[PDB]
Structure formats: C-alpha cells, structure tokens
Amino acid sequence: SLLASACTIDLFGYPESGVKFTSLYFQFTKGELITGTPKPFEGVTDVSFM
Amino acid sequence: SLLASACTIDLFGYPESGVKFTSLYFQFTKGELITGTPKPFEGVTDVSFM
Ligand SMILES: *[C@@H]1O[C@H](CO)[C@@H](O[C@@H]2O[C@H](CO)[C@@H](O[C@@H]3O[C@H](CO)[C@@H](O)[C@H](O)[C@@H]3O)[C@H](O)[C@H]2NC(C)=O)[C@H](O)[C@H]1NC(C)=O
Ligand SMILES: *[C@@H]1O[C@H](CO)[C@@H](O[C@@H]2O[C@H](CO)[C@@H](O[C@@H]3O[C@H](CO)[C@@H](O)[C@H](O)[C@@H]3O)[C@H](O)[C@H]2NC(C)=O)[C@H](O)[C@H]1NC(C)=O
Numbered sequence A, B: 001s002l003l004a005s006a007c008t009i010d011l012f013g014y015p016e017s018g019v020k021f022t023s024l025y026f027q028f029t030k031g032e033l034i035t036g037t038p039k040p041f042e043g044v045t046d047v048s049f050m
Helices: none
Strands: A007-013 A019-026 B007-013 B019-026
Touching: none
Parallel strands: none
Antiparallel strands: A007 A019, B007 B019
C-alpha cells in the first residue's frame, strides 16, 4: 500500500504483453540500528567483524 | 497499461468538470530503425530524400 514519504520498487512480469505484479513502497530513515545483512548469523555473540 | 521504464502522456477532456480519458505509456529506446514519419510513402523504393 502507499506509505507517506516512501520510494517505490515496481515488480514486472513478461509471460510469453507484460504486467505489473506489484508495487512495494519503502519507508525508511537512515542510521545504525537496523542492518540489511545477507543472512542470519549463527554462533554469534558479536555481529561485527573485520 | 503501465510499462516498465516508460513515460506517460495523459489525455484529458473538458465536457461542458474535466476528466482523464486515458494514460498512454511509452516505452522506447533510441536509434535509427523505426521512424515516426507523418504518413506512408507511395511509389517509394528509397524512403530517404534530400
Ligand atoms: C571490538 O572489540 C571487542 C572487544 O575486544 C571484540 O569482541 C571480542 O571478540 C572476540 C572474538 O570473537 C571474543 O573472543 C571470543 O570469546 C568467546 C567466549 O566469550 C569464545 O567462544 C571465542 O572462541 C572467542 O575467543 C571476545 O569475547 C570479544 N570480547 C568482548 C568483550 O566483546 C570485537 O570483536 C571487536 N569488534 C569487531 C569488529 O569484531
Ligand atoms: C543515396 O544514394 C542512392 C544511390 O545513388 C540514391 O538512390 C537513388 O535514387 C534515385 C532517385 O530516386 C533512383 O533513381 C530512380 O530509379 C528508378 C528505377 O529504379 C526510376 O523509376 C526513378 O525515376 C529514378 O530514376 C536510383 O535508382 C537510386 N539508386 C540506388 C541504387 O539506390 C538515394 O537517393 C540517396 N539517398 C537519398 C537521401 O535519397
């Protein structure tokens, strides 16, 4: 659904005459608390590494 | 319908309280192959002229 102050990602299909499947609205703000990691961590007491 | 990566031309009417009749979505890329000429050519073996 539409969120205030959000950007949109439009998902399309070409079935073989394309259609729009859905519109994903992303509402977000910047900072450190939430991180989009590629996967869950396992056996991890401290997520950070280097 | 909506096309991915397309521009829109909105067609409106004022009937005498206006309405939008339709939205035309244009999906295109640049180059030489397809040309929007004003009309068909007749008796033409070579479309180009100068
Ligand atoms: C930032 O500094 C902290 C503190 O030194 C680093 O955390 C330390 O990370 C090491 C390596 O994972 C931990 O050692 C581990 O201890 C556990 C038992 O608790 C053991 O099972 C593992 O084999 C390993 O020896 C250490 O506990 C941990 N120290 C603390 C107090 O957090 C951290 O790694 C640094 N940041 C980054 C980028 O990793
Ligand atoms: C780019 O150069 C080509 C090649 O010279 C030009 O094409 C030539 O155009 C002339 C004029 O239309 C053609 O002459 C015509 O011949 C037909 C019979 O085939 C005849 O019925 C007409 O009365 C006229 O005499 C000629 O055939 C044609 N040559 C070839 C091989 O394409 C062309 O005009 C040039 N590009 C542009 C911008 O026109």
